[model samples]
Target chain A: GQSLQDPFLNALRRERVPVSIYLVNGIKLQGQIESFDQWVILLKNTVSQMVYKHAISTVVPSRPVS
Target chain B: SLQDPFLNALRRERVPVSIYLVNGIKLQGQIESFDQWVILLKNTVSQMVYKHAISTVVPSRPV
Candidate 1:
């Protein structure tokens, strides 16, 4: 819901924070949040990856959130 | 619920399944029940699995 997803991701998007996105398959993707919809999130490290939400396990920011 | 229909189908059909969590652990059971947040797996023992930690669910046969 907006409670956790928005405030955290929105701030990350606005501040351009680097994130470690861990996939359910155990792949660690390093990137900044470019964009997302309900189904997928676009992660970018200049090589943008279109990742499905179903495959995502965790999104850990490199630093503390606001 | 992108995954609801598949899980529902599996449950009704009594499909034996292998549920893989994000941590890469596989739990073998038949899906007894599920909602948006968790799945109750019956494997002689019951494991209530959180959807957020689930990775993939593979049925023994076509579901």
Candidate 2:
């Protein structure tokens, strides 16, 4: 998915961490994905499920801090 | 000297790295499960690098 997305890329680029290294490591550690799209989908679904589960035990803040 | 070449190789392969601090208040979002947390984070990161305007994309594993 990564392309010439300057603003997004630059922000990340400026950061101390290199995203590509992480991705490469992730793939190596986790093993390669069949497709990038598949990886995205996998991440999305897994995260959503996690959010939902966490939501149950966690209470949403009703209002801004007074 | 390092023990195995693997360690050196791993470090060599490593992208430029830096450490940053996180404040608890910054992380407002919550996940139903740790699995979800990981997945969600990956998704968010992927989107930011791909579709959105970004630069010099690289991967660095979470600590």
Candidate 3:
């Protein structure tokens, strides 16, 4: 299957773009993307957080998509 | 591509839908387009909603 997440997130990771990942629950988690796979995204700031894909609503990068 | 048929039908028919998110917020719109990861919903404005954040999508009426 084709993925929209791949190119978008890879671009962010390559540039070390800081992002605000909004959950459907309305909580905002901010970090640079460390890594990702089929089910979760590893986000890192100082401490790292494993964010479940199902819980995320939006991934907003500080810079425009490049 | 499993969701492709269902979502494509909604877009093709222009069915107004109520999209419920995992957080309990409800959004209303018509499906404009959808891909593997996100759906473009059109209403007052176009909203890009990630599929992972969605709980359910109910059409205004049975389609």
Candidate 4:
């Protein structure tokens, strides 16, 4: 899984696109992926430019909303 | 006016994830790409369309 893991992570690092983060608890956050690790992710909010570490969930990366 | 940190977290980790929709179906996959309204999941193990259809998304967590 780590082999599958590295390339995926590397790709995100390469692009650093704007992303949407959705939590199981139904909290949606929009940001750029600043950094990440096994247990946490750092997101810099597009609107506020604040960074946050979020737990595991689903992520959709692409252009920001206008 | 946006939503998505959990989905991003799982994809960032490149780990498997499962999501339940409003229609009572569950989908599992490694998300390949996505936007605000749609998600492209690769190595998809399980399906549906609609942001409203999304009930819950968990990291490799199943029903």
Candidate 5:
């Protein structure tokens, strides 16, 4: 829900980190939201406040949250 | 005569990459026909080669 649709997530899973660990192993979110815009809005409000909040607001911090 | 078998094989190992042929419209007049054809061919080749190189370096991204 937080991420993009099927095709994009599939490509993201294949890439491995430089540290030779699994970055993402084709994970799937069960429920389907009506629109991706809803998910992004939800992401900013709920999950990590640091996520898209920095780009949204110019409120100063010690370091870049993004 | 200049073609080498080994180098051709190396080229074949590349991933399948798609490029858009931007200049779809063709010229009808005789005077402008050669120039138009050359321009379209150049555009096609340039886009094909440029996108192929980019795709090789980067991850397989879908639009």
Candidate 6:
């Protein structure tokens, strides 16, 4: 299957848009999509960073995709 | 409080579903059991490392 990260990363880089990433443990990491790789996404958090590729359940964009 | 409509409806239908977990993994299975705290999926399961990470449960469509 094609990786689902490319378009998402491209959009994030283009817009520095804030997103709320829901973790599997019911924790939420609200931040910008700073960077990402094969296994994890680096979030621009209020405090610092986080991890996940298979661990994230949702990405709530601050603004709807147009 | 009333149970979640989506879950209730899925349970009632007893259909197969795809669950999206916080970790980005998607699992497909049947609604085996559930409570306010956790949901038990029958058939194939996931890593089960962070069981609480489930964000949404989507029912499969008929082809």
Alpha carbon deviation, residue A52, candidate 2 (Å): 37
For candidate 3, give the docking quality class from DockQ.
Answer: acceptable
Question: What are the per-model C-alpha RMSD values against the true structure?
Answer: 8.9, 18.3, 4.5, 11.9, 19.0, 11.7
Q: Tens-digit lDDT track for model 1 on B9-57?
A: 8889998887667777878899999987889999888889997777556
Better of 2 and 3 by TM-score: 3
Q: What is the lDDT of residue B18 in candidate 2?
A: 22
What TM-score, to 2 decimals, does candidate 2 have? Answer: 0.18
Give one digit per residue, the lDDT tens place, for model 6 in B1-63: 544566667777888888887556676777655555445465532111223567566779851
Mind giving the per-residue lDDT tens digits that candidate 3 earns over B1-63?
A: 447888888899999999888888677888877777787677754545798788899989998
| Best candidate, TM-score | 3
**lDDT tens string, model 1, A1-66?**
345776777788888889998887886778898776665566777544445578887899998767
The best candidate by lDDT is: 3
lDDT of 2 at A13: 30
- Per-residue CA lDDT of model 2 for B1-63, tens digit only, reads 332242233334543222111111111121111121121112223322111111222234431
The pairs that clash in candidate 6 are A24-B53, A54-B23, A54-B24, A55-B22, A55-B23, A56-B22, A56-B23, A56-B24, A57-B21, A57-B22
DockQ of each: 0.10, 0.03, 0.30, 0.07, 0.01, 0.13
Q: Give the TM-score of candidate 1.
A: 0.53
Ranking by DockQ: 3, 6, 1, 4, 2, 5
Lowest summed lDDT across 10 adjacent residues in model 2 chain A is found at A49-58
Candidate 5: tens digits of C-alpha lDDT, residues B1-63:
111221122234432222221222222111111121121112223321221111001102210
What is candidate 2's lDDT per residue for A1-66, written digit by digit as tens?
Answer: 123223332343334222221231122111111122212311121232111111111111112111
How high is each candidate's interface RMSD, in Å?
8.9, 15.1, 3.9, 10.3, 20.2, 11.6
TM-score of each: 0.53, 0.18, 0.61, 0.43, 0.14, 0.50
| TM-score-superior candidate, 3 or 5 | 3
Ranking by TM-score: 3, 1, 6, 4, 2, 5
Clashing pairs in 3: none
